């Protein structure tokens with residue numbers, strides 16, 4: 001890799017994802033080919049998430065990707081893509097490609113939900129969405145077409161709706177921490193930063209490590225009764241009284257893959273968490289100029305077989321006329337956690353020499369212990385990636401109390417955690433003065449609240465503070 | 476249901492799928508909301524198939540749904556949907572919404588595959604696809620947008636390519652036979668009916684049972700070196716000599732769901748195969764009822780634990796008989812009644828959706844029996860189905876025999892010379908006397924007495940082929 005992650009971040013990223021066989025670049029601006037190597041990780045977290053939501057009793061469906069002008073409105077225009085022709089012929093009416101599916105599902109919900117006996121209704125779909133973005137295209141993080149999951153539910157009490165929102169968030173925390181080994185903070189968006197139609201947005205926030213900029217990784221809204229008013233979704237309660245449902249919607253995209261890449265990669269290339277990577281261990285024969293290659297190769301496939309059995313996603317790189325060192329590089333680029341060398345002396349000893357991707361430390365593992373050790377090592381490695389990552393993160397958060405402390409913190413590539421009065425009016429103020437001195441918005445009010453002494457003034461107004469809140473520059 | 480499968484077939488279907496909660500009708504013509512009850516079945520066969528391909532080494536990926544006019548129009552113009560405007564602004568260039576993904580993938584393959592060391596390449600995606608259809612829209616069977624799976628691969632030899640084609644087909648047979656309980660015949664297509672760019676097209680064909688009309692369930696093509704020429708997909712072989720890959724593609728859609736409905740449903744409503752249905756058994760209490768509801772949960776738990784997809788319909792102010800109907804409509808294979816007497820005996824009364832035979836099952840034997848019952852039922856569905864199907868195929872020998880069979884609502888199996896020129900004739904000649912095309916030459920070939928004349932030309936026959944009216 002030419003560019004360096006701390007010198008030339010933009011170009012680094014571009015390089016690791018292309019060299020690491022994750023994406024391919026494409027002739028439509030904003031759209032990128034997800035390749036097997038990356039796609040599989042999307043499969044990994046998806047199954048996890050999908051199981052998770054099934055346990056909660058959500059069921060999947062599929063609405064159509066095309067929407068009508070008529071239905072698409074309750075008085076963003078640029079971001080919509082419109083289909084106008086079939087071959088040469090116009091359509092008598094232009095149809096939008098969905099940016100979201102709210103305006104498609106809610107009309108149906110009003111029809112379907114008639115009585116308390118229809119609730120709850122918990123649907124979700126795995127679809128693609130299009131949003132012609134004004135902002136700059138970046139692979140995974142912000143693209144013009146993207147895969148996501150998008151869930152919409154409806155309930156007889158807010159209570160029940162809210163509980164679900166929280167469950168889905170915890171599921172997102174896991175998506176990220178347990179599988180991507182990416183640390184994230186649960187919080188609750190500020191009024192101007194939440195979802196407009198929603199009563200409340202809760203969210204998990206990441207911090208691109210070197211940059212010092214926060215980023216939204218997934219959302220989970222309590223929609224309250226608001227869309228229920230709009231699309232007139234009513235139900236007869238136990239009593240007989242017509243009433244409005246309480247609703248939630250939530251979502252998380254292939255952006256997750258992008259955060260995960262940036263969270264772990266280094267100048268040698270990608271570094272992928274073993275829980276979701278495609279090949280966890282790649283066995284590589286080292287053979288000399290002289291003969292005897294066949295035995296080495298043999299013991300490689302034997303060891304492969306033994307590991308497969310033990311559960312390990314193994315793979316032997318046997319490519320002929322292609323020197324081992326070259327291979328070492330190919331797979332390091334691609335982020336494979338363990339490399340397993342086998343040369344003449346490893347055969348005669350009865351071992352493989354095991355090189356770890358994140359730290360580059362080698363170790364001899366006897367074939368006899370491989371099927372316990374290798375699993376052991378990956379499981380170490382996954383927690384390590386999370387833990388190193390979790391700390392860089394923890395580091396990047398300064399707990400302040402006055403406005404004076406902000407621009408120093410900011411200029412150290414840090415984010416701040418400060419007492420706040422939470423008046424929405426202050427948000428655009430704070431954005432502006434910070435840019436004045438690039439801007440810094442509220443990122444989220446975290447659930448894990450450090451203690452708030454009676455007295456505590458808001459850092460920006462002096463008014464009594466309500467709650468700690470994260471502020472910082474963003475993406 | 477008002478309509479009847481035998482009498483007003485089109486209205487019936489529309490009825491069963493709406494009253495059965497599979498789809499919902501939608502203001503864009505040709506596009507229907509797949510509802511949970513139907514969607515789950517798509518999940519069922521999809522996992523099957525996905526696991527199947529994975530065992531064959533096929534990894535999934537995602538290409539984009541938008542294509543350049545440049546790329547697309549290399550090489551049914553009315554079928555393409557074009558995006559032209561973002562908000563109000565015309566894009567510099569219009570972009571097509573994919574109908575298939577061949578023009579998006581085969582370029583990348585040309586780039587990616589360079590050395591014998593890059594083969595085989597086996598990719599697949601689970602995506603949606605839009606084709607603006609001239610022909611009339613029908614739920615699942617032919618729609619404008621549809622979910623499908625589409626697989627593309629590239630190999631050093633035809634040998635290896637072909638093998639995979641056949642593997643994928645066998646997976647499709649199972650897709651249909653083992654999970655949907657729909658019978659299908661494997662076979663190879665004729666030239667005018669195969670895929671244009673394909674060397675050979677193999678296929679599983681169904682027969683909508685009443686209709687007398689055949690239908691394509693899934694395709695699996697040997698592309699050969701065709702597209703490799705077109706897109707210059709080349710590789711330096713073991714010996715150092717630049718060469719063209721051999722390729723395959725294959726695909727199967729939410730149409731499968733539609734055949735499945737047509738193949739089992741009756742005038743009471745939907746009748747769904749227990750291996751894929753959402754709820755296999757719905758317990759229903761009958762009250763004149765605290766104990767009753769209690770036993771219903773107790774039995775629900777027991778069955779859940781036995782592997783069975785249970786659900787208890789407990790809805791207050793909603794009389795049992797009503798419920799019986801709701802669930803019959805929705806296709807649930809087993810209805811488990813529990814009224815006062817069933818509680819006092821320690822049993823549930825178990826009613827089959829397909830036949831309506833009732834049976835008493837004691838709770839003590841339930842966790843053995845119910846699985847046993849469903850597993851029976853699934854086979855019974857395939858077996859009636861397969862029987863109707865076998866019955867619809869008359870093995871003829873001359874043109875004389877054809878119009879009778881066709882008018883009998885049947886399909887025919889006749890020896891053929893396989894000359895492509897005859898296909899168009901046969902279509903006309905029959906459409907005259909609506910038409911009849913060659914559906915597929917089946918893999919399982921009845922024997923060919925030396926001397927056998929072609930039923931249409933008197934030329935020597937190559938092989939038995941299926942012919943009949945279609946969809």
Ligand SMILES: Nc1ncnc2c1ncn2[C@@H]1O[C@H](COP(=O)(O)OP(=O)(O)NP(=O)(O)O)[C@@H](O)[C@H]1O
Pocket residue numbers: 131133140141142143144146216217218219251252253254255
């Ligand atoms: N274009 C995109 N590409 C990839 N992921 C996206 C994209 N837009 C949004 N997301 C992610 O999906 C989550 C839910 O989307 P949503 O909250 O509806 O977007 P939004 O409100 O438009 N935020 P933003 O797109 O940044 O203006 C966001 O929090 C992002 O993590």
Ligand SMILES: Nc1ncnc2c1ncn2[C@@H]1O[C@H](COP(=O)(O)OP(=O)(O)NP(=O)(O)O)[C@@H](O)[C@H]1O
Pocket residue numbers: 606608615616617618619621691692693694726727728729730
């Ligand atoms: N519009 C559609 N909606 C749903 N499934 C379809 C549709 N068109 C085709 N399929 C299914 O997908 C399989 C592969 O499609 P394909 O090979 O493109 O056929 P085709 O060229 O579209 N033939 P035809 O459907 O008569 O136009 C078909 O054999 C059908 O089983």
Ligand SMILES: O=C(C[C@H]1NCCC[C@@H]1O)Cn1cnc2cc(Br)c(Cl)cc2c1=O
Pocket residue numbers: 076077078079080099100101102131150151195219221249250251
């Ligand atoms: O998409 C949303 C809110 C929620 N929709 C369901 C998935 C989870 C998500 O938080 C906000 N949003 C974002 N982008 C949009 C782009 C267009 Br174009 C339109 Cl019409 C509408 C929207 C729009 O409503």
Ligand SMILES: O=C(C[C@H]1NCCC[C@@H]1O)Cn1cnc2cc(Br)c(Cl)cc2c1=O
Pocket residue numbers: 551552554555574575576577606624625626670694695696724725726727
């Ligand atoms: O879709 C095919 C060939 C194969 N593609 C992958 C899935 C399985 C399928 O048999 C044939 N086909 C069908 N319909 C098409 C419609 C349009 Br519009 C275009 Cl451009 C091209 C096509 C086109 O190539």
Ligand SMILES: [Mg+2]
Pocket residue numbers: none
């Ligand atoms: Mg946006």
Ligand SMILES: [Mg+2]
Pocket residue numbers: none
């Ligand atoms: Mg077609």
